[PDB]
Amino acid sequence: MRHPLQCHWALWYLKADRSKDWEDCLKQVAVFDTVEDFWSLYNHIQAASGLTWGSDYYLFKEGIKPMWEDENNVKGGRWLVVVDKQKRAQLLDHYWLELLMAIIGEQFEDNGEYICGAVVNVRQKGDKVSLWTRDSLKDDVNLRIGQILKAKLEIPDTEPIRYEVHTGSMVKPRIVIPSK
Amino acid sequence: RIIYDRKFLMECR
Ligand SMILES: C[n+]1cn([C@@H]2O[C@H](COP(=O)(O)OP(=O)(O)O)[C@@H](O)[C@H]2O)c2nc(N)[nH]c(=O)c21
């Protein structure tokens, strides 16, 4: 018996392609719903850090396309956490794995229903790791998630994580930890 | 609702 996950998650992958547009690079790798199956994917895919520039992995509930326009996201936000370009080597893969284990293992308490997914952006300037939420206004639910994200990933108080919505002005973040 | 911690998940590897 494999151990059933509360729900079905989908791994997505996107490699940057200059000529082609965005949505067509968005490739659904597999859909799993047991711990054993998650590992089978994870053990055998390319480590996040190993990835080329402009590439992502998304892990989202099934039937949620990992984009803004999607209905599950249209009214949501995310918990952005930047990885320093130079301390990237020893942090990135921990942060991403620790998150995926946090989400599939349902660690955000009575708040799980608001988790949409998790994204890793491999980039030159900085690598990014975010947790997408369903509704960018439930600041209790968002704050609580962020506290847990900070715990799970052991992000210190000197590297602040921020929640922000999904122009006119530069839009400032809705929540920050530690606060200012 | 099914809850698995990181300790457990790693024993599944
Ligand atoms: C997550 N996302 C990214 N893009 C495209 O990806 C690019 C932005 O890239 P990014 O992956 O948000 O990070 P970057 O700002 O460091 O490049 C733009 O060209 C967008 O058109 C997106 N385009 C749409 N329509 N919807 C999305 O959810 C979406």
Please report, for the domain that includes residue A48, its CATH number.
3.30.760.10
Cβ neighbour number for residue A178 with a 10 Å cutoff = 10
Cβ neighbour number for residue A158 with a 10 Å cutoff = 6
Contact assessment for residue A129 and residue A115, using Cβ atoms and an 8 Å cutoff: no
Q: Give me the number of domains chain A comprises.
A: 1
Among chain B residues, CA nearest to A5: B2
Domain residues for the domain of A169 are 1-180
Among chain A residues, CA nearest to B7: A101
The beta-carbon neighbor of B4 closest among A35, A39, A43 is A35
CA A35, CA A101: separation in Å to the nearest integer?
9
CA A130, CA A100: separation in Å to the nearest integer?
11
- Strands (E) in A35-155, as ranges, are 56-61, 77-83, 115-121, 127-133
Contact assessment for residue A163 and residue A146, using Cβ atoms and an 8 Å cutoff: yes
According to DSSP, residue B7 is labeled H
Interface residue A8 vs chain B (CB under 8 A): no
Q: What is the resolution of this structure in A?
A: 2.9
Q: Is A148 in the pocket of ligand 1 (CB under 6 A)?
A: no
Ligand 1 centre distance from Cα of residue A110 (Å): 31
Q: Do B5 and A6 touch (CB under 8 A)?
A: no
For tokens 């639910």, the residue is A141
Residues of A in contact with B8 (CB under 8 A): 105
DSSP assignment string, A33-99: EEHHHHHHHHHHSPPTTTPPTT-EEEEEETT--SSSSSTTTTT-EEEEEEEPSSSHHHHHHHHHHHH
For tokens 């994204």, the residue is A119
Residue type, A86: Q
Residue B10 to chain A, least CA–CA distance (Å): 9
- Strands (E) in A110-177, as ranges, are 115-121, 127-133, 161-165, 175-177
Ligand 1 centre distance from Cα of residue A22 (Å): 7
